[PDB]
Amino acid sequence: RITTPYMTKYERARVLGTRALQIAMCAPVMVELEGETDPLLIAMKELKARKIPIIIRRYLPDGSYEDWGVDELIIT
Amino acid sequence: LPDVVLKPPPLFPDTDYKPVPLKTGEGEEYMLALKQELRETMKRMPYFIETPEERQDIERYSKRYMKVYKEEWIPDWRRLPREMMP
Amino acid sequence: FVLVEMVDTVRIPPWQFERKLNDSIAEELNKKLANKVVYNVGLCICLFDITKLEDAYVFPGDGASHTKVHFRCVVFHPFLDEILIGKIKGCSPEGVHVSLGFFDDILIPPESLQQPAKFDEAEQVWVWEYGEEIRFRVVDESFVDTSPYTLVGSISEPGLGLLSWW
Amino acid sequence: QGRFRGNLSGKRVDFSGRTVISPDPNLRIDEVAVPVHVAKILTFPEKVNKANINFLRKLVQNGPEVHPGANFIQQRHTQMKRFLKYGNREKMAQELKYGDIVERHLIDGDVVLFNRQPSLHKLSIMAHLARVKPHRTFRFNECVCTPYNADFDGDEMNLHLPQTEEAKAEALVLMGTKANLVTPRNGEPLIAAIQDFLT
Amino acid sequence: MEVKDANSALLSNYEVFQLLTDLKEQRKESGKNKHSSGQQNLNTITYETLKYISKTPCRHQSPEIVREFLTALKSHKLTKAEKLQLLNHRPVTAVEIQLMVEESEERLTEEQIEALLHTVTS
Amino acid sequence: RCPDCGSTELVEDSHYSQSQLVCSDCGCVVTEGVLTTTFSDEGNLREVTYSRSTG
Amino acid sequence: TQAEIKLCSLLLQEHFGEIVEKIGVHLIRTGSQPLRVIAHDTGTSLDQVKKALCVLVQHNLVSYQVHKRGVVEYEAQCSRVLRMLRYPRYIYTTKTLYSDTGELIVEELLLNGKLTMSAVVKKVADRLTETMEDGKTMDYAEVSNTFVRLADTHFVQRCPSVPTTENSDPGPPPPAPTLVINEKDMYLVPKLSLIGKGKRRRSSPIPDDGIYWQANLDRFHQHFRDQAIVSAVANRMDQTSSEIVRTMLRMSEITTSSSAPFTQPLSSNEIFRSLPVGYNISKQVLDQYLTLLADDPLEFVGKSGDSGGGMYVINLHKALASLATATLESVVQERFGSRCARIFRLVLQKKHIEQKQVEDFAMIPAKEAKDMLYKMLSENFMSLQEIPKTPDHAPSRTFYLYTVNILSAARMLLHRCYKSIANLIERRQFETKENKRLLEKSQRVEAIIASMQATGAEEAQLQEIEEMITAPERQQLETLKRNVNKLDASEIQVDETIFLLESYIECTMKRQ
Amino acid sequence: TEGRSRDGGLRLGEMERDCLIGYGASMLLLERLMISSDAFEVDVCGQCGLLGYSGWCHYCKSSCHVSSLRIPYACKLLFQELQSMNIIPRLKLSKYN
Amino acid sequence: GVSECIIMGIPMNIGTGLFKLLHKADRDPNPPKRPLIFD
Numbered sequence A: 001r002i003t004t005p006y007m008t009k010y011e012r013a014r015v016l017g018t019r020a021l022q023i024a025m026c027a028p029v030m031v032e033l034e035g036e037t038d039p040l041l042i043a044m045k046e047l048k049a050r051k052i053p054i055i056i057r058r059y060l061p062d063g064s065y066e067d068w069g070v071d072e073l074i075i076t
Numbered sequence B: 001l002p003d004v005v006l007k008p009p010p011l012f013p014d015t016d017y018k019p020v021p022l023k024t025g026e027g028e029e030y031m032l033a034l035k036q037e038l039r040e041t042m043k044r045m046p047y048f049i050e051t052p053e054e055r056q057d058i059e060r061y062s063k064r065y066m067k068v069y070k071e072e073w074i075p076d077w078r079r080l081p082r083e084m085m086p
Numbered sequence C: 001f002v003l004v005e006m007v008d009t010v011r012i013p014p015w016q017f018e019r020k021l022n023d024s025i026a027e028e029l030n031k032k033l034a035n036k037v038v039y040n041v042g043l044c045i046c047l048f049d050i051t052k053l054e055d056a057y058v059f060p061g062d063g064a065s066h067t068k069v070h071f072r073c074v075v076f077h078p079f080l081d082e083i084l085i086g087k088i089k090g091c092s093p094e095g096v097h098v099s100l101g102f103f104d105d106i107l108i109p110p111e112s113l114q115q116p117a118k119f120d121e122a123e124q125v126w127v128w129e130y131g132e133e134i135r136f137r138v139v140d141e142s143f144v145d146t147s148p149y150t151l152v153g154s155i156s157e158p159g160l161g162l163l164s165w166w
Numbered sequence D: 001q002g003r004f005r006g007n008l009s010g011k012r013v014d015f016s017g018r019t020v021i022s023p024d025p026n027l028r029i030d031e032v033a034v035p036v037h038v039a040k041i042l043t044f045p046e047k048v049n050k051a052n053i054n055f056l057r058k059l060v061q062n063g064p065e066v067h068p069g070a071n072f073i074q075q076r077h078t079q080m081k082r083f084l085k086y087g088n089r090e091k092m093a094q095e096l097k098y099g100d101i102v103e104r105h106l107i108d109g110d111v112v113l114f115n116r117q118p119s120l121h122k123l124s125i126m127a128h129l130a131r132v133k134p135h136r137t138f139r140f141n142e143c144v145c146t147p148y149n150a151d152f153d154g155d156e157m158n159l160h161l162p163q164t165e166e167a168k169a170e171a172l173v174l175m176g177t178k179a180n181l182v183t184p185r186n187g188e189p190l191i192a193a194i195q196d197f198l199t
Numbered sequence E: 001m002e003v004k005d006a007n008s009a010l011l012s013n014y015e016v017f018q019l020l021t022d023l024k025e026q027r028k029e030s031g032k033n034k035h036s037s038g039q040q041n042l043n044t045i046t047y048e049t050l051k052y053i054s055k056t057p058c059r060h061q062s063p064e065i066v067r068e069f070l071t072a073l074k075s076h077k078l079t080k081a082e083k084l085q086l087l088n089h090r091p092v093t094a095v096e097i098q099l100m101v102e103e104s105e106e107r108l109t110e111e112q113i114e115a116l117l118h119t120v121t122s
Numbered sequence F: 001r002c003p004d005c006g007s008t009e010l011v012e013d014s015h016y017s018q019s020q021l022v023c024s025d026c027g028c029v030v031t032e033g034v035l036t037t038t039f040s041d042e043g044n045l046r047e048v049t050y051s052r053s054t055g
Numbered sequence G: 001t002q003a004e005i006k007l008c009s010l011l012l013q014e015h016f017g018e019i020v021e022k023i024g025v026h027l028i029r030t031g032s033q034p035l036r037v038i039a040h041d042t043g044t045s046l047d048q049v050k051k052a053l054c055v056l057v058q059h060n061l062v063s064y065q066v067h068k069r070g071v072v073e074y075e076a077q078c079s080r081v082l083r084m085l086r087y088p089r090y091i092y093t094t095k096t097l098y099s100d101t102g103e104l105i106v107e108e109l110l111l112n113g114k115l116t117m118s119a120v121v122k123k124v125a126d127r128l129t130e131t132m133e134d135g136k137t138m139d140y141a142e143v144s145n146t147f148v149r150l151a152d153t154h155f156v157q158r159c160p161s162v163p164t165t166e167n168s169d170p171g172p173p174p175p176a177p178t179l180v181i182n183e184k185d186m187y188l189v190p191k192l193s194l195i196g197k198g199k200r201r202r203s204s205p206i207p208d209d210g211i212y213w214q215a216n217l218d219r220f221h222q223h224f225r226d227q228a229i230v231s232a233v234a235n236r237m238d239q240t241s242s243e244i245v246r247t248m249l250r251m252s253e254i255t256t257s258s259s260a261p262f263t264q265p266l267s268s269n270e271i272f273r274s275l276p277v278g279y280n281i282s283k284q285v286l287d288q289y290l291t292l293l294a295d296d297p298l299e300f301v302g303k304s305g306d307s308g309g310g311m312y313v314i315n316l317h318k319a320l321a322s323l324a325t326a327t328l329e330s331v332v333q334e335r336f337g338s339r340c341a342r343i344f345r346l347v348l349q350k351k352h353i354e355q356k357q358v359e360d361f362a363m364i365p366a367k368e369a370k371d372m373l374y375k376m377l378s379e380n381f382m383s384l385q386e387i388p389k390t391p392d393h394a395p396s397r398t399f400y401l402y403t404v405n406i407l408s409a410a411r412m413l414l415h416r417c418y419k420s421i422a423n424l425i426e427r428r429q430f431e432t433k434e435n436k437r438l439l440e441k442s443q444r445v446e447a448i449i450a451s452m453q454a455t456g457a458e459e460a461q462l463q464e465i466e467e468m469i470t471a472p473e474r475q476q477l478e479t480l481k482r483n484v485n486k487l488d489a490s491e492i493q494v495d496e497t498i499f500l501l502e503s504y505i506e507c508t509m510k511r512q
Numbered sequence H: 001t002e003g004r005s006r007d008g009g010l011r012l013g014e015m016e017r018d019c020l021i022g023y024g025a026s027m028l029l030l031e032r033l034m035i036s037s038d039a040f041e042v043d044v045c046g047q048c049g050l051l052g053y054s055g056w057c058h059y060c061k062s063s064c065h066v067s068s069l070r071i072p073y074a075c076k077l078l079f080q081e082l083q084s085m086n087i088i089p090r091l092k093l094s095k096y097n
Numbered sequence I: 001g002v003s004e005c006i007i008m009g010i011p012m013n014i015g016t017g018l019f020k021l022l023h024k025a026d027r028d029p030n031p032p033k034r035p036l037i038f039d
């Protein structure tokens, strides 16, 4: 709860990559795509809809961690 | 010029000399007897601490019948530092 | 029959994310430890229950869901004195080939401890008369791979009388 | 050319091309034109899912001769590779199971890298959206000439194609042309108007 | 792959029977083609062990009866192994307690066998 | 030969800077990729003859 | 000292177990370390570390010292761990110089490390009860007499006892009792007027508390060195000279220490008076013997004075050097032959010598003497001085002369003997574990007979033991037994060479 | 290979690696410099820390602790060359968690 | 270090590899345990 409430660009890139890799592996679609054959476009649509089932586990250097949901974080 | 060898040397090269036969007599016989007796009698002594058996399966009625009971020697704590008391 | 605490890493592919995790984990654990023998433990039967299930990580590689699951599973391992009831699925001159009912054919009792009336003349003769009881004696384990089974154990047959069958 | 500098710090890769560049104002700043000849060579491995099944079927039916298509098909169960140049492509297209790896040709919308050999700052290599054109040169918007420090006087340009969805997403997000309009040195914008546009 | 405890808690055949029935009903309610084709040994071992337990007198049992039997046998100073074997075998005859039961010496007393029979028959 | 159908009609054809073996019937490859020496290492290595590597 | 560590590990695993041998090897390899870091590095439970340390300090194998902040540091003695292999020789020499009572006394002292006089006499009585028969019983008087006779002869010594804590700063006790030793009561025995009779093990308040004894390995080493030099001079000149030197060494045992270049001055008159009366030798014959021993090219004895008639002294260091030379030439002769032994003795007599000079003085044709020289140099028995003509040290313009360094040769020979005994112990354990199934079969078929030996002994159980499948395998059992016996005999025989080499190494050490 | 006539590909020099590091694209750099250039699969034994083949450790003469591992081929060549120089890199494996 | 991450072929700690991701799967931490009857 002490880190930045906004969602950085590296987190966005990693989440989109993981979601595209999952969708390419026949993952269930949560946004009901309409003729989108590119998995990265599907990941972009899911990020825009704020329904990505991925929780960012931020690790502090001392050892402490914290979980942040996609809907909880602020996207740009 | 040394010739080429098609086979590596054996793992146990032979030597024309052999070990001298062992000394015999009542002395060496008593040596063997005493060494065997010590090897036998030293294992059951309390000094020979075996590894504590673990992952005990269950407790049975005949445990007290098969319980390994042996006298335990008490080390002199006056000569031993205090950091070894269980 | 005894419980064993097993901590295993389970990889669930992303195309099974629609399924419940607590069910897919159990299914994968049952598929991974079916009709197998854990070394120095015994033949595991199936998953009994799941005690602890921590967070589900996703690695930057395969991308599947990896979970470290703590669970308890049932295995078959007598305590060197348990009495079992097996059926005679064969017999050899050096020892009878008795197999536990539909469980495993690994029990080979040596014919060298009962009263001196033991002889198998290859005609499926169990024991020269004066649902078979079995007394396990010692377990034994070994490896399989040695180049680029493992649980048989001995059986005791004391003077149990056997009023129902000789 | 030792192990440390020539084989560990920097090493050669495949799925890359090197071509002469030429200006094209009719393309967006985040888009780049790729010749059909290089597009038919550089392939991307896509996995068959419930969404792009028909598109991959059509690509397989086209074959390695027509530009929109594939060159090899990898099955899910077995790790065998099938060349689409021989055999009835309709059979393999109708026998496309989920999870199969198909090496499709470079088509529009694919995120592709674009780099010059002398790399001074990070903006010398950027990720763009690939587009195909019948010509034989790498065409892009001239507003990106300032980061690349190109002058269209015969200088060769490199182009790398990632083979992983994670790498493609990282290239589109971090190395996106629209997301790197300013240099991290002093914040001054580099992708802007140039000669024949200012006048 | 690591093992924590091979003999953490001993269980009788009734718990194994219940677990087998639960796994069988879960598999028949959630049957999958590829999951079955991946490892067919699961269904085989489950069915065979269930049939073996059904051949035994392990039927007609409940956890309350097992708890009552345990509380009744705890008063006869018997160990866990003997009561476990008695529960797994369910001896309806006295000869199986006087002869088949190990360590019968000094434990029969010619009077507790009737109580053991009355408890195992209930 | 073909691993599935057994056809032995495997042909060597030059791909886009790639050498591989493929059957003309099912279009399945059996062996792809070839390892060739680089001229950078060729000028470094010294040739040895069997007139000298035998004594 | 990898071979030494391996031998100590094998001996500890054979004698005390596994959880303690690991702590012992850790102490030997890492030196003195506190208990906490020992438990941390070993990775075992703390109670097992405490038990290992206590069972090690019981046999006087390890020691503990105090340092800054009152921390206790435990250090192992690799030499003490190596010396425990020589226990059968100690028991044999104490059974030869004394009766079997002293034999059992030293046996119990070695098997227990630290014990009291009452405890050891009780154990000796209990062990000797089953030895004798006819209903009679023994007392503690003769056992105490044998104990005090061992004490005055310095074979047994009182363990270092903690001083009186009441007089030494009565209050907060330190973590370690700080055991000290006093030379006054080192061999003194307090009076124990209590007596008793040992029980026959039917299986149906301490006046000497705080006083613990242990076998003095220094006395045994000195006695073995004396026996070795006596056997040497007997094989050299005669048995009469051996008896003379045995008498002089017996006289010098008390007046000299364990480490000295020479003994105390002894005159011929007192040696003649202390000589046993079994020899009808006159004073003139003794003087002739002494003056011919003084002219020996070995220089075992020396005049070193003329007062008091015939004054003479013995050379301990020179005698040990001669014994080491004899051992080295013997092992060279047995490993490479008589001609190579001749070459070795030639290159040992002359300080420096050249190849052509070697061939001339040894009378050996070419292509063989140089081969023997190379074979002896490849085994670290000789060294080349390599006197250079130029500081470049080019081989073409420098000389090469062979020279035998007895110190390094003895050290490498001791290392070879250590590794040899380790390999013998490993082979014995391998042969034991590979036949453990036949061993258990024999044990069970012999315990069927061991049971019901007297009570319920029916004859029907005597014709079926040999009927088992172990009967054709009895030859393998006999071979295993004779192999174990031969391995143990070889180890005990190499132990004497190890003792000789260790004595020769230690005698030239000054510890300065 | 290096030359164009030898069907050689492009080279990701030091400056390209520097730019990819500055962008923070870990997965892109991993795919470029490892997966698409010199990817290989070796076998490492967790006991001795050496390299094995076909899931077998010739050193320990066992195959229980042997596990497969992805690696750039240049790194394996470097390890082999260092082992030839009596400089043994002992690889201590661990779980990905 | 990033150098050995590139050499050994593992994702570098800097960049996107600093944090970790968790999949939001439908589950129940510490599921109900089957009770023991004999013990």
Ligand SMILES: [Mg+2]
Binding pocket: D150, D151, D152, D153, D154, D155
């Ligand atoms: Mg230019």
Ligand SMILES: [Zn+2]
Binding pocket: F002, F003, F004, F005, F006, F007, F023, F025, F026, F027, F028
């Ligand atoms: Zn085919």
Ligand SMILES: [Zn+2]
Binding pocket: H045, H046, H047, H048, H049, H050, H057, H059, H060, H061
């Ligand atoms: Zn290994």
